[PDB]
């Protein structure tokens, strides 16, 4: 549970403490979902069931469609502006 | 220990040779397509072409990332060689999820196209690298979807299980349109010129290109056509051999690898043969061909297969 | 019969042109009306609070959920009857309030996402349905792409909803780690004694609650509500609130919760004193959303909150809906129009509205007195029935701070009237064109519910008694 | 030029139109509709006329529902 | 007619893969002691191959056959320990 | 019921069966012989195997400690069948599992020594292969002629033995 | 042979290191390159625990699609970015040194069921005990993991796959809802 | 749902204690669940092995201090290529 | 030590060697885009990702007989209407201004 908690906490503080660009926010958000998976899949193994793996194979998909949606949101934000700012939106 | 290091030695050395003799085979056959001699020869001295220009290619100029993308492109092109079997149960590593691996490495192969456009950047060159990337992923879709509709008849992710299932009839002869569209999706993964707007450290892209050529030839050969299968050959052996011996296992492994290599060699010749005859695509035509016309047919073939397995009993058991 | 609509209309909208969008929305409106009329006999299924678990311990169908399930279609008819229908037939009113091509698709995808939470039993239906509705708010926000504020608002809402979605998924995963099951009834009142669950069940609550505007994290939602256009925001202020609040109220996972009681008090404080010095109307209106969504963590602390909740939710939805429709009427009479997406921005702008017409200010007066709990109105008995449950179950300081919050809030509700009944100097003598008939009949009906719902109060209590007990 | 007649201005003429001018959407939608429509019409004809369905495979060890009559034999 | 210089590369490629696969089958048969490989291995089959290694003594898939077990077969049974998986 | 680890460490225990469980005559047959003799130890020891799995069912959780008596008796009668098939048809049994040690132990590849073994055991040891759960008007698969799935190489000794059994007329 | 023992704690240390190289990088592409490094360290851990199937699904979709997606976005877009300077980011240090301690310890609290608040934490680390693996011969066909996911998504949880269809539907409609500008 | 389905489709490693507890709650009137508690305590210890961990800590605590170490039939570790060597 | 793992250890060594011989032997020393280019990759993901939702069915196709069939058919038939959304809306097609709009010449 160490590797999942560490990816979650450190990815979270990498989300919170940026002021430099917009993409570090996206990729820290994506590694938080990885960090939740790393805890869930080991609880599937140690309890001997698939149902944590059921929630895993569902949240893979929701992380995917999340990225598709949110990067179309960014292209909306970029079309009207000229250049995505350093400080943020 | 010694038992397996000699084994991976023989396989690595054979595949490393065969990818280098393809660079000679393409020059020769395109020479005789256009009535030229082309390269002087092809023998044991014949590697000294591909050796000599592979040496001289390392003498030009280039103008940390630039180090990494040729490297990961070549190692992605080289790790996929374990999972092909060359005979029954002969793999360099045996794994029950070989198609999942093969599929994940067709997914890993796209990154060098991204990271090659960053080096020596311009605005227009960066846009061109974007176009090569997007056609690469666009045909990777239909690649993966037909892998599914092949393993619908197998219902197993093991590869020797596919070919032993294939023993009764090859999958190419019921699903012949699938062979046609895979051959074009196979010259689509690679940049073969019906499909090559976006072309028209370099030694790694050069090697990994032909390695992907012959490796997607392998991926055709085991799942669509017979992998190592030619015929039954039960009757010829009962006349030749008297009992199992190392000569007998040699002769059968020999004929199995011959039946695999003839598939791979005819398909490999057909890549160079479809190179010469046709001009190249507009990129709009490329994306339009991938999505609007071919992929609705792909959904249709995908719906018509389980319904055909449904009409009869005919669900495959793991 | 949502998906029977969605699958059909998505093919129908794919082929229709940009001019056809109004009449598409008119079709979907009438469809939802007849789904409410011809299919509302399913109340008979329950008669003694009978609950069904459908699709195999996955959805949960009871009568609380049937009422929310009916409420959402009703308010969607009122919302879709706005985009279908012209306000006036002028050049301005065509270039204002234009519905996009994919908007009517995203509404019904959001209603699918909102209904699959109130009906939800499993955690995986919870997670998939909060994701479906969170995407739909990401895209209902951003569909007016050629607006600077709307694009900035959608990009903010994205990352904040993303953090709270991973916090919910962490809580779900953690409850799975301490107990093998996902369903909430694996609790069944013997776990909670012998098991430290308080931290998990609050973090599951606080994950949804912070998505709605629980007040340490209230600053981002007010910014999104002020930045979207004035018609996206009536929908995206109503829907996620009522959908997850009826989730968290149906499944009482945080009783006696001290964190919930603190944040309830902090909500009632900072909402009622945040709306005090504010000059923008959607702001004032969104903090009125905040205090009223903070008479909600209160009932969430309770046990057996299904008279107080349901009565107050349909109170609040009618009152909410009516006052947004009042300022959508008020934009014709104002002298200055900025910002095509968001035409009235300041509450200074609707001055002297009684000299323009008097009956729109009569309507505005009954809704603003219904927010502050004036006794012959329907909004009064909502606070009365919250207080008959707060005091019933021991929350006495909560009751005093509830009262003080209501009094501080009325100070900025009445600013709308203080502005709207004053001398203007430029009165209207004759309007050539008149407002659309059905779209003012809807507001007249929503008034007469507010002013005459105490008539049927007693019938509702008897009906309620039969059908939830 | 060949323009759209409409599905509603004559169905069969429209299908004849779409077979010529858009065969990448006719013979793609007509090969995928011939699956779930043939699964509702060609399966009872087979179960009556060609051969009935197969016996199901076992999945675990098949326990009977008896009450252990006492066996005799293989004592020591 | 047919060009021989065009067909000698593909002849070399064909012969390389041929000799490779023949060598591979002989190496696998030499490791297993004269029997072909198991290509698809169940969990059941993996437990069974471990039991065969335990039974025959040391060698891989010797496939011995006996009316009973030896007395050492009762005692050589192993359990697998496994780290905490933190 | 679980697949092994990152780093699993094997161990054994030099110990003894303590006091009250008597000594037993355990099956010392490898995968090929007991896969070959599976239908025959399933045909003779049906009620003992049934009785053991029933006793394991009825003592829920007691389980392992409860029916030591009775997994003693399935081993004895399975050992009895395989001693009888040794002394009965060691040559043709051996032919069948020397076949079945190639071909991944696929049963598909060895029809030819199989039918010979089935004649031998049905004659001397009078046990018969049945696939139960098979309703009538469904042919059992090891009886059909010209199957679709044929092996790669028919092994040599069973070709010879099957041809000589044709010539003798015992088949 | 006990070189082959610490393999899990190794990858834990590598994940710590790899996120330190996520949030401290010059280019915006260097961060996603260490991110695909993080996905493959994760997939090594997932193979290591006993899940060979997932690791390759993580390679297929996480250094598969969404990688290529992010690399693609960072190519064809300009994004200003500053460096991790001390004059703009040392002010965050005394909050980080509190939140590290509190969030890690509290994230290791809820795996326990006592009510002492020090015996809760000390059950997270007090686990050096080797689980014993027995062989049960009850399973007859190789229903591996992916078969059981395909049995549970399709029978027991068919509605989650069928709502999932609507989510992927929305992931197709949304970018066409935005990025088209019809007429 | 997927209540007690295992990795291989069977039952969990703690399905029996859970099914015992659900027998307990099926026959028990609400607010009479205090008699139902020991089945629950058995189930939570099946999941997390807490009491077993504390007991093995106390056994190892008495074991690790002594200079004699071990006077018992010992547990012999082997390398993986030597399961059935002897 | 099996024969699978020397290969995927030994290949990065082969790449490092072919790279170090290159470092030994060599010589050294924003524009606006179209919406179709961004949309191909953004929209590629929900079509790559239904494929992996389709991957658990294809392994377990025998067990879910007659019932998981219809669930997969309905799943695909819900996906085809979003596909026909994007092909009705001409989403991937990129357009240009080469037409003179073909307006007839009007006089006086
Ligand atoms: C079996 C027999 C063989 C199969 C039948 C063979 C033909 C299949 C239909 C061909 C598709 C129609 C078509 O026009 O071609 C392609 C069509 C193109 O049309 P187009 O001519 O290009 O339009 C251009 C015009 O300018 C645009 O013109 P437009 O603006 O007029 O729009 C054209 C129209 C084009 O679309 C259509 O015309 C197709 C409409 C057919 C809908 C019904 C088909 C299913 C029939 C089921 C039969 C069940 C009984 C089976 C019993 C079997 C027992 C064994 O689109 C719509 O109007 C919207 C679709 C409305 C669908 C309503 C569906 C819901 C009600 C029906 C189901 C009710 C169930 C209730 C149960 C639930 C209770 C809770 O492609 C699509 O758009 C996608 C079709 C999606 C189908 C849904
Ligand atoms: C997003 C990014 C995702 C980030 C993930 C990383 C971390 C995630 C964890 C955080 C998740 C979010 C946190 C949300 C807030 C946590 C909610 C929380 O406090 O529950 C606490 C648990 O009491 C601890 O034992 C709380 C003690 C916790 C240990 C303190 C921390 C140790 C710091 C050492 C310095 C209690 O609630 P509660 O009011 O119902 O509890 C009351 C109250 O305890 C009793 O007196 C009442 O009688 C009873 O009715 C009960 O209801
Ligand atoms: C939903 C309705 C309610 C929302 C709030 C709920 C209240 C609880 C239930 C209420 C029950 C509602 C029943 C429907 C009432 C039916 C009804 O009175 O005739 C309508 C209102 O028609 C809706 O406006 C129809 C209302 C909206 C439905 C839109 C589609 C029809 C009265 O317009 P109206 O005569 O002034 O309209 C006149 C008149 O038609 C002609 O002089 C002219 O052609 C026209 O320009 C206009 O001047
Ligand atoms: C001919 C139609 C023409 C087109 C009209 C379209 C839409 C009309 C929509 C709404 C009109 C108001 C109907 C209210 C029904 C409440 C049912 C109910 O009190 O719910 C109770 C429980 O409520 C509660 O807990 C508390 C809710 C508190 C409501 C607070 C505001 C009420 C004051 C005004 C509302 C009554 C005004 C009557 C006007 C004549 C459950 O009982 P139930 O679920 O079996 O009732 C539905 C049976 N049904 C479907 C056949 C009608
Ligand atoms: C990059 C790391 C991502 C790991 C990918 C996993 C590749 C894989 O599929 O391994 C499968 C293989 C065995 O899998 P299986 O199908 O069960 O084999 C059946 C045997 N008859 O597994 C193997 O045979 C060997 C596994 C190779 C993977 C090496 C990863 C080691 C990570 C060490 C961490 C060091 C830092
Ligand atoms: C059974 C019922 C149904 C009956 C119908 C049968 C359906 C099953 C068959 C499915 C197989 C489909 C094969 C792929 C379809 C190709 C589509 C096509 O060729 O035309 C469409 C496309 C242009 O689109 P469009 O705008 O409509 O152009 C009109 C010009 N006529 O054209 C293009 O853009 C490009 C055209 C060339 C494509 C690339 C060529 C690759 C060259 C490889 C050729 C094969 C080489 C074989 C080598 C070995 C031969 C021994
Ligand atoms: C045998 C009888 C049944 C055959 C019916 C065939 C109908 C043919 C559909 C058709 O006409 O397609 C062409 C038309 C194109 O529209 P157009 O006017 O050219 O302008 C927009 C172009 N983008 O319409 C279109 O826009 C194309 C929209 C349909 C695309 C279908 C491809 C998706 C894959 C379908 C899989 C099969 C689904 C079948 C349904 C299964 C459940 C019953």
JSON list of C-alpha atoms and ligand atoms in Angstrom, two decimals, chain B residues 177-178 180-181 183-184 187 194-195 266 270 273-274 278 281 285 288-289 293-294 297 301, chain D residues 24 27 31, ligand 6:
[
{"chain": "B", "resi": 177, "resn": "UNK", "atom": "CA", "xyz": [-11.44, -10.09, -46.53]},
{"chain": "B", "resi": 178, "resn": "UNK", "atom": "CA", "xyz": [-9.74, -9.91, -43.16]},
{"chain": "B", "resi": 180, "resn": "UNK", "atom": "CA", "xyz": [-6.81, -8.27, -47.37]},
{"chain": "B", "resi": 181, "resn": "UNK", "atom": "CA", "xyz": [-7.48, -5.51, -44.84]},
{"chain": "B", "resi": 183, "resn": "UNK", "atom": "CA", "xyz": [-2.20, -6.69, -45.30]},
{"chain": "B", "resi": 184, "resn": "UNK", "atom": "CA", "xyz": [-3.03, -3.07, -45.93]},
{"chain": "B", "resi": 187, "resn": "UNK", "atom": "CA", "xyz": [1.80, -1.80, -44.54]},
{"chain": "B", "resi": 194, "resn": "UNK", "atom": "CA", "xyz": [1.14, 3.45, -50.87]},
{"chain": "B", "resi": 195, "resn": "UNK", "atom": "CA", "xyz": [0.86, 4.94, -47.39]},
{"chain": "B", "resi": 266, "resn": "UNK", "atom": "CA", "xyz": [6.16, -14.65, -49.40]},
{"chain": "B", "resi": 270, "resn": "UNK", "atom": "CA", "xyz": [4.66, -8.93, -51.23]},
{"chain": "B", "resi": 273, "resn": "UNK", "atom": "CA", "xyz": [6.01, -5.87, -54.48]},
{"chain": "B", "resi": 274, "resn": "UNK", "atom": "CA", "xyz": [3.28, -3.48, -53.32]},
{"chain": "B", "resi": 278, "resn": "UNK", "atom": "CA", "xyz": [1.56, 2.40, -56.52]},
{"chain": "B", "resi": 281, "resn": "UNK", "atom": "CA", "xyz": [-1.50, 9.08, -50.43]},
{"chain": "B", "resi": 285, "resn": "UNK", "atom": "CA", "xyz": [-7.13, 10.32, -47.98]},
{"chain": "B", "resi": 288, "resn": "UNK", "atom": "CA", "xyz": [-10.49, 9.13, -44.50]},
{"chain": "B", "resi": 289, "resn": "UNK", "atom": "CA", "xyz": [-9.57, 5.60, -45.60]},
{"chain": "B", "resi": 293, "resn": "UNK", "atom": "CA", "xyz": [-14.94, 3.63, -44.94]},
{"chain": "B", "resi": 294, "resn": "UNK", "atom": "CA", "xyz": [-12.89, 0.70, -43.56]},
{"chain": "B", "resi": 297, "resn": "UNK", "atom": "CA", "xyz": [-16.86, -2.47, -42.31]},
{"chain": "B", "resi": 301, "resn": "UNK", "atom": "CA", "xyz": [-17.50, -7.86, -39.47]},
{"chain": "D", "resi": 24, "resn": "UNK", "atom": "CA", "xyz": [-18.70, 1.81, -47.93]},
{"chain": "D", "resi": 27, "resn": "UNK", "atom": "CA", "xyz": [-22.20, -3.00, -47.44]},
{"chain": "D", "resi": 31, "resn": "UNK", "atom": "CA", "xyz": [-23.08, -6.88, -43.17]},
{"chain": "J", "resi": 6, "resn": "LIG", "atom": "C1", "xyz": [-19.82, -10.35, -48.75]},
{"chain": "J", "resi": 6, "resn": "LIG", "atom": "C2", "xyz": [-20.78, -9.16, -48.74]},
{"chain": "J", "resi": 6, "resn": "LIG", "atom": "C3", "xyz": [-20.04, -7.86, -49.05]},
{"chain": "J", "resi": 6, "resn": "LIG", "atom": "C4", "xyz": [-19.34, -7.94, -50.41]},
{"chain": "J", "resi": 6, "resn": "LIG", "atom": "C5", "xyz": [-18.23, -6.90, -50.51]},
{"chain": "J", "resi": 6, "resn": "LIG", "atom": "C6", "xyz": [-16.92, -7.44, -49.92]},
{"chain": "J", "resi": 6, "resn": "LIG", "atom": "C7", "xyz": [-16.65, -6.82, -48.56]},
{"chain": "J", "resi": 6, "resn": "LIG", "atom": "C8", "xyz": [-15.56, -7.64, -47.90]},
{"chain": "J", "resi": 6, "resn": "LIG", "atom": "C9", "xyz": [-14.25, -7.15, -48.48]},
{"chain": "J", "resi": 6, "resn": "LIG", "atom": "C10", "xyz": [-13.58, -6.30, -47.41]},
{"chain": "J", "resi": 6, "resn": "LIG", "atom": "C11", "xyz": [-12.17, -5.99, -47.85]},
{"chain": "J", "resi": 6, "resn": "LIG", "atom": "C12", "xyz": [-12.11, -4.49, -48.10]},
{"chain": "J", "resi": 6, "resn": "LIG", "atom": "C13", "xyz": [-10.73, -4.13, -48.64]},
{"chain": "J", "resi": 6, "resn": "LIG", "atom": "C14", "xyz": [-10.42, -2.67, -48.35]},
{"chain": "J", "resi": 6, "resn": "LIG", "atom": "C15", "xyz": [-11.48, -1.79, -49.01]},
{"chain": "J", "resi": 6, "resn": "LIG", "atom": "C16", "xyz": [-10.80, -0.70, -49.83]},
{"chain": "J", "resi": 6, "resn": "LIG", "atom": "C17", "xyz": [-11.80, 0.42, -50.14]},
{"chain": "J", "resi": 6, "resn": "LIG", "atom": "C18", "xyz": [-11.44, 1.00, -51.50]},
{"chain": "J", "resi": 6, "resn": "LIG", "atom": "O1", "xyz": [-10.67, 0.41, -52.17]},
{"chain": "J", "resi": 6, "resn": "LIG", "atom": "O2", "xyz": [-12.01, 2.16, -52.03]},
{"chain": "J", "resi": 6, "resn": "LIG", "atom": "C19", "xyz": [-12.25, 3.22, -51.16]},
{"chain": "J", "resi": 6, "resn": "LIG", "atom": "C20", "xyz": [-11.09, 4.23, -51.08]},
{"chain": "J", "resi": 6, "resn": "LIG", "atom": "C21", "xyz": [-11.57, 5.53, -51.72]},
{"chain": "J", "resi": 6, "resn": "LIG", "atom": "O3", "xyz": [-12.75, 6.00, -51.15]},
{"chain": "J", "resi": 6, "resn": "LIG", "atom": "P1", "xyz": [-13.75, 6.68, -52.25]},
{"chain": "J", "resi": 6, "resn": "LIG", "atom": "O4", "xyz": [-13.85, 8.16, -52.03]},
{"chain": "J", "resi": 6, "resn": "LIG", "atom": "O5", "xyz": [-15.12, 6.07, -52.13]},
{"chain": "J", "resi": 6, "resn": "LIG", "atom": "O6", "xyz": [-13.07, 6.39, -53.71]},
{"chain": "J", "resi": 6, "resn": "LIG", "atom": "C22", "xyz": [-13.86, 6.07, -54.82]},
{"chain": "J", "resi": 6, "resn": "LIG", "atom": "C23", "xyz": [-12.95, 5.44, -55.87]},
{"chain": "J", "resi": 6, "resn": "LIG", "atom": "N1", "xyz": [-13.58, 4.27, -56.43]},
{"chain": "J", "resi": 6, "resn": "LIG", "atom": "O7", "xyz": [-9.92, 3.78, -51.72]},
{"chain": "J", "resi": 6, "resn": "LIG", "atom": "C24", "xyz": [-8.72, 4.25, -51.15]},
{"chain": "J", "resi": 6, "resn": "LIG", "atom": "O8", "xyz": [-8.68, 5.23, -50.49]},
{"chain": "J", "resi": 6, "resn": "LIG", "atom": "C25", "xyz": [-7.42, 3.50, -51.35]},
{"chain": "J", "resi": 6, "resn": "LIG", "atom": "C26", "xyz": [-7.64, 2.36, -52.32]},
{"chain": "J", "resi": 6, "resn": "LIG", "atom": "C27", "xyz": [-6.41, 1.47, -52.28]},
{"chain": "J", "resi": 6, "resn": "LIG", "atom": "C28", "xyz": [-6.20, 0.93, -50.87]},
{"chain": "J", "resi": 6, "resn": "LIG", "atom": "C29", "xyz": [-4.71, 0.78, -50.59]},
{"chain": "J", "resi": 6, "resn": "LIG", "atom": "C30", "xyz": [-4.17, -0.29, -51.53]},
{"chain": "J", "resi": 6, "resn": "LIG", "atom": "C31", "xyz": [-3.18, -1.22, -50.84]},
{"chain": "J", "resi": 6, "resn": "LIG", "atom": "C32", "xyz": [-2.59, -2.10, -51.94]},
{"chain": "J", "resi": 6, "resn": "LIG", "atom": "C33", "xyz": [-2.68, -3.56, -51.52]},
{"chain": "J", "resi": 6, "resn": "LIG", "atom": "C34", "xyz": [-3.51, -4.29, -52.57]},
{"chain": "J", "resi": 6, "resn": "LIG", "atom": "C35", "xyz": [-3.54, -5.78, -52.26]},
{"chain": "J", "resi": 6, "resn": "LIG", "atom": "C36", "xyz": [-2.13, -6.33, -52.44]},
{"chain": "J", "resi": 6, "resn": "LIG", "atom": "C37", "xyz": [-2.15, -7.84, -52.29]},
{"chain": "J", "resi": 6, "resn": "LIG", "atom": "C38", "xyz": [-0.72, -8.37, -52.43]},
{"chain": "J", "resi": 6, "resn": "LIG", "atom": "C39", "xyz": [-0.74, -9.88, -52.57]},
{"chain": "J", "resi": 6, "resn": "LIG", "atom": "C40", "xyz": [-1.56, -10.26, -53.80]},
{"chain": "J", "resi": 6, "resn": "LIG", "atom": "C41", "xyz": [-1.14, -11.63, -54.32]}
]
